UniProtKB/Swiss-Prot annotation:
It catalyses: Selective cleavage of Tyr-|-Gly bond in the picornavirus polyprotein. The lineage of its organism: Viruses, Riboviria, Orthornavirae, Pisuviricota, Pisoniviricetes. Zn(2+) 1 binds at residues 50, 52, 110, 112. The active site is at residues 15, 33, 104. It comes from the Viruses. Homodimer. It comes from Coxsackievirus A16 (strain G-10). This is Protease 2A. The chain holds residues 869 to 1007 of 2193 of the full protein. Cysteine protease that cleaves viral polyprotein and specific host proteins. It is responsible for the autocatalytic cleavage between the P1 and P2 regions, which is the first cleavage occurring in the polyprotein. Also cleaves the host translation initiation factor EIF4G1, in order to shut down the capped cellular mRNA translation. Inhibits the host nucleus-cytoplasm protein and RNA trafficking by cleaving host members of the nuclear pores. Counteracts stress granule formation probably by antagonizing its assembly or promoting its dissassembly.
Amino acid sequence: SGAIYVGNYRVVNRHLATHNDWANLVWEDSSRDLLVSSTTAQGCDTIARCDCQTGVYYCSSRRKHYPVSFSKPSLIFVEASEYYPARYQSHLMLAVGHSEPGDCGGILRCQHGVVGIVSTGGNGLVGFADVRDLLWLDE
Ligand SMILES: N#CCc1ccccc1CC(=O)N1CCC[C@H](C(N)=O)C1
Ligand SMILES: [Zn+2]
């Protein structure tokens, strides 16, 4: 679990969005596993606008942060789950690092701010849904 809070927006994994997120829907994209909802309170986070490929992510299944080298956002095949059929997920970045079911929503950050959130994983890999291209989050 986990979310990004920036301005009057809450960014969460689409498959973990609540009834309240859907009732205050701003934008969603099943192909990216992202959903953005509106909030009444101003948010705590800053979004990176960069092309960093190194950063640090929070891993809830270890209660620890880990450094990672990650691939550029791309179209990656993701196996079927209870949430989605087998499909290509877009804007996804992979890295070697621990992740297990329950770790989605952990933040990945570089020196410029928030880069994205955990969205996939398995076998010593962790995948992050990029948010750096969503320029409208800042206005
Ligand atoms: N961290 C983590 C998740 C994880 C880690 C390790 C093993 C398995 C998983 C679960 C998994 O990859 N997904 C289930 C939920 C929806 C995700 C998607 N974006 O399509 C895919
Ligand atoms: Zn950066």
